[PDB]
């Protein structure tokens, strides 16, 4: 039945190898498994996608319009730079939860700005991969 | 195992104050939800709400070494109080910052949080469910 | 018909503190002038001054639904307190901001007011007569 | 025989027709009548002028030097843009009360700044046309 | 049917003589003729005014309230400076198209801010005097819809 | 004679479905049809491309260098963010008209900045899809002169 | 023969009466006399105009195009606010010297900005009325 | 001859809080040091620490006309309270500002002090010895 | 057998044709040949890639992790806008030399900022295509 | 009566350095012109040019009480040196600041002058004639 | 045991320059005060004042490894010289920054110090007594 | 054919000062490396290091018209000296800016260079090898 769009942006494929002091030793496979297990608890399915390509994420949002209950998004660095990604989230009309493994507000000033936070129903930061589980919980209860 | 639940100024008005922004749940609903989630991990909650910054700072000092972590919604003090950030550091409690609303979608002066500099995680816009996720983070860090 | 009159920190020192800026009138004079003006309109005033922000916040909360409006001189909190603006909003009282001095003629840090965002009216530099006009605004809104 | 200069800047001739949700349904004729009635209570006269030309207000201020007890001015949009009008108020040496029908601090950021507030003895905003009655009362008592 | 208010602000009277490398060699009379001819294609008339005096522009906006279908405005330097002129456009209640002969966003930073852009339904910049023809076309079609 | 490059950036494929209170109920196909019909009035043709992929827009600009008389571009959100897209317009050497359906200067502050505006000969904003028709008219007349 | 356009903007008519601590006790008549005497030394004439009206100054610049050797301008407060005045100076094509009786850079921050300095051949500030004499000297030698 | 010694929020935690920044000395140590320096000049010290800004403001109001001066470590209120500045001005007390750490070597939000606008002197980074220097300044004024 | 990743970002395929007054008449093929010849002098190989797609450079950086001695990157306009590319360089763990044909600091202000300079071991600007020869020399000696 | 003429760094290159900006006159031409003008008022000039800030500061200290004023073109030190402003204040010389070019028409970093805070007058863009006007100001202040 | 005492540009004019701000004490007074405080702790003071930044930099370079610390009043260089900061770092000397006035109560351009980033301690507004406190800080380090 | 090699303040301390940032090479090593590289191209180097800005300025002036170019590491003057940029411009030498460290990776005050506005090339973070590349740029421009 209900489907959640799980979108991971640039560099998320490198989770577990990239800056482990900041992002931890968990993998993207762990993220998808955790979100899928949480959704299954609520009778929902997860359609997951990761890409270093902003255009692929936008295409995914457009394609999910009208057919998914919501979106869990970790835009990566696009969080602080893409108005196009924000416009895509708005075009999707999907209730969207923004997730960050790290706490961007405890990092460089350029990470303190998120175009997505303008459209997101909720923002979860610094909870590690557990943020994805909470994000699924939010969407399952909005629905 | 004990979690300190701290709600700052105006949170006693939850359910009455600006319901289009903060919703129709109450501070009692917040405390009962954090309590129910803490019980799933075999923990208890010590809850305090105050309109007085000094009472929150005294509560953080008093919890040092005796609590496993702090769930804090500093309210307006989020954006203004260095003294509260120094109190969180002095407590040495792992701290999750919660906001009912999404401050990044509101006025520019709400985009700045002193507490986000020290918090292990920040949850915004999830309504009262944010407090449930914050207990989950603290129970799993301690674990 | 009751007007909440709130004076913030340091206003107890009116007549002694910086008399070249604030003049020689006292807080007693302020309360008496506001009381006499309210009486002309069949109204009473409940007055409170405090060096504690939490006491002002508690007063706004306690006056919700029972008072016709608030006259507030926030003192130095004018420039610093988001929590006090949130309390004015939680109170749902039509609020007149009063400053004895003209803050726009003083240091740059006094040019910004959180309360001015939510106030129905702002009166500055009329001395203690500003409290008389503030009562007249609230009595006529009530009419 | 004591005389007050009442100045209304650009667009105030449209009072009652322009943006009634912001400025109300009263007219410029109502404003002048209200100021005149208040002045008469104190044995004072009001010389009123409105113009869509900044130069006309400056001329009026110069011509009033030494012959008027004070000035009540609503500069309109000139409030946020004219250093020339500020210099004129100072050249006049007239005690000046700045009046705004609306509360500019509750509006767009460009309206939060006033050159005239730097020289005004008092600033009244958001009291509707009653602000002009309070302004006359201030001048009659300074005198 | 109906009348469009065409307003040109300070210095536009100097069109063809002032900084021709930036503003071109056409005159203000060419602008008015072009706007009038475009309006005529839609059975509309144009009341044109230019002034170095901001108050005259404000008076023209006040006087046009309720009797014109819209306003085409090139505020000149007042674009970047006048809150009073924005308040006058709001008081007019006229649907307004802002026109610039040059492309202000390709010029000095102080030209990158427009008060009028906050109220205008459309902004046309850098089309030379042809921007006034497009502005009449927008107002003719808003009115028709 | 000649061909105009019409480029639409990210999200424009969603025209008619995305935020219709801001962008209207016309489709991207209506935009292309309108531009093509205007071009035909001048004996010109239009090569139209839309993509959510910035690289595709850059490739289209590179490929159009020397063979097209000009470019009409609605960069979408890339307007506010992409230096790479400005560098591509410069590399194209095409006279460029920037078009926005909405009036970005009446929206959020982050929409008030355009890299493309630094290179465009003209900028048209808030005319709905009619801005693309005016943009073809500008390019048809620059080419004629 | 050669003619210099001397333009004095808003408030300059008040020279000698306005803020004498800042602007001195000399009059506008003194300014015109001094400039006229200096020009006469070089076989030149001065066409002087003062107005509180920006439109009058712009009209004067347009009218002087092609018939004057240059312009001496004290724009008053328009110095820090008018792009229209700058555009007019450029349209005039007149070599222009900007003159300030006071030193604006030793005053409020808003006086530190001049649109005219962008077009002026020279800027003279703080020399009192003597600045006008120097300005005539510059234009007589450019010519 | 009496000096008002005011310590702001969190200073009660001196010795336990962020010892790599504030050291291992305690508030008791600060009060003893200031009291001994004051006694060398025949002066006494009325000391108060509070996490409650209103209490510090009341203390300043009550010391008006009775004290030779004030030594103040406002804590985080240093960067946030106009009210505390207004209180210092209302006190009319010559005031020395003291910081155990050097705020200018820390986060930008700590580079701003409202009290520094009114203080006769500002001492930073000298640890608890700053309080001894501050007493010396008020004694020689 | 030691391998250097040579990355050229958007528009660099147009080298020799685009803005020749700024970037010169040399081509991308010249750049790759120059880097390759320099690498061969040190017994090293160069794997070169250019793309108008940010995602392709990110993919290339990820794929090169652990298998290359370093990276020479000219990000093009991505230099001033992509946090994702910076995160990618860090994920790669490759010593990276940033190269600009032009001197961006001598150009528009928006070109004065580089995200890549935050992670690069070295930055070479304005040496034309010789910058790529110097970059290879840096990597060959760090190695 | 003696005037101190101080020229800062690079002014020895006048006539060679950036002639499109500074013209074709020399530092010798500057000194001879100031000398000729000082002689019309019965004064002498002591001229020093140095590329060393310390030598200018020593010259200001040494002129204290013995000179009637200072004509200074600080060169690049205009925009950067607080030490030079403190030296001008320590000298107690009435000081006229001269610039050959118009800094307000150049790069933003040239729009700031520490010396303009202390100077009685500032002359910019008049070429070497500025020095002549500066001597005239000093001769008439002393008079 | 030797302390390097460095005074920057204009400090030679102490007593004559802006006496309403800097007081009537002289540079000779500052050096004597610091020297006497140093002698109380069995230490000596090598003092230098200069209007030439290069001389101050050379002094810091030459004191590397030979001095217990540095007391510095950089004058206007405080708000302008990265070179002087680089010199302090090159010296490796524990450094106390001293200001006779309180720069935070003055013009905004005086609110910024490059030296405050490297200094162990900053003392402002105590007049020439700041130098005595600075010697005390280095002696107890 | 002669290259002016200028090293600014503190560079005499290379190898002792902050070795974790600048490394263990000495100023002698810098001069010897630059000298050997120049010799390969039939060129010589005239080297100067000073803790005095005026000495560097004098050197640039003295090298005008006789040297083929300048290699400059301005030290802390990079971030602070307008007078040094004006000297580079007065010299008319094609100039390469060299930094041993990568200033973009360090404190914000080190991110700004006056010399970078005028330099033909900027090389940062290559250690002392940056001086070798700088000589190679100047020799090939000369070719
Ligand atoms: O790519 C990432 C990861 C991130 O989104 C996170 O999950 O923490 C935070 C971003 O700032 C960063 O660019
Ligand atoms: O008091 C509150 C409530 C809040 O903390 C929240 O929960 O959303 C957000 C704050 O900005 C505000 O001042
Ligand atoms: O405490 C006060 C009094 C005040 O609010 C007034 O009444 O003028 C002005 C405030 O700036 C100041 O901090
Ligand atoms: O013209 C007006 C009217 C106004 O002064 C008022 O009365 O509220 C407020 C101004 O911001 C505006 O430009
Ligand atoms: O006066 C004008 C003309 C203008 O409005 C235009 O038409 O291009 C642009 C304005 O910036 C300038 O001040
Ligand atoms: O994508 C779009 C559409 C737009 O370019 C327009 O056509 O109005 C305006 C942009 O700000 C926005 O990001
Ligand atoms: O009106 C004046 C006079 C003035 O131009 C002068 O002559 O000093 C300076 C201006 O700042 C001021 O607004
Ligand atoms: O509370 C404190 C302690 C402090 O005042 C000090 O003593 O160093 C410094 C402040 O920045 C901080 O908030
Ligand atoms: O694409 C490029 C080329 C460039 O990186 C260079 O090589 O100089 C400089 C960048 O600013 C520009 O966007
Ligand atoms: O050195 C100079 C010359 C100068 O002072 C002038 O005379 O125009 C202007 C300064 O900005 C520049 O640094
Ligand atoms: O030269 C000095 C003296 C000073 O350092 C002091 O001692 O107070 C303060 C500095 O701001 C000023 O430039
Ligand atoms: O003195 C130096 C050395 C330096 O120029 C370098 O070589 O890296 C970098 C500068 O920031 C610093 O002040």
Author numbering:
A (entry chain C), D (entry chain B), G (entry chain C), I (entry chain B): 2 to 144
B (entry chain D), C (entry chain E), J (entry chain D), L (entry chain E): 3 to 145
E (entry chain A), F (entry chain A): 2 to 146
H (entry chain F), K (entry chain F): 3 to 143
Manuscript excerpt for this entry:
We determined the structures for CgDHQDWT with the citrate at a resolution of 1.80Å and CgDHQDR19A with DHQ complexed forms at a resolution of 2.00 Å, respectively. The asymmetric unit of the citrate- and DHQ-bound structures contained four and six molecules, respectively, highly homologous with alpha carbon, with root mean square deviation values within 0.2. The DHQ-bound structure of CgDHQD explained the substrate-binding mode of the enzyme. The substrate is stabilized by hydrogen bonds with a water molecule, side chains of N75, H81, D88, H101, S103, and R112, and main chains of I102 and S103. Moreover, the neighboring residues L13, G77, G78, T80, and P105 organize the substrate-surrounding environment of the active site. A glycerol molecule exists in this structure to occupy the space of R19A variation that eliminates the enzyme activity for crystallographic benefit. There are six residues that directly participate in enzyme catalysis, including R19, Y24, N12, E99, H101, and R108. The Y24 positions toward the 2-carbon of DHQ to function as a general base catalyst with R19 and R108 activators. The position of the water molecule is known to be crucial, and it mediates the initial electron transfer from Y24 to N12. H101 and E99 give a proton to the leaving 1-hydroxyl group of DHQ.
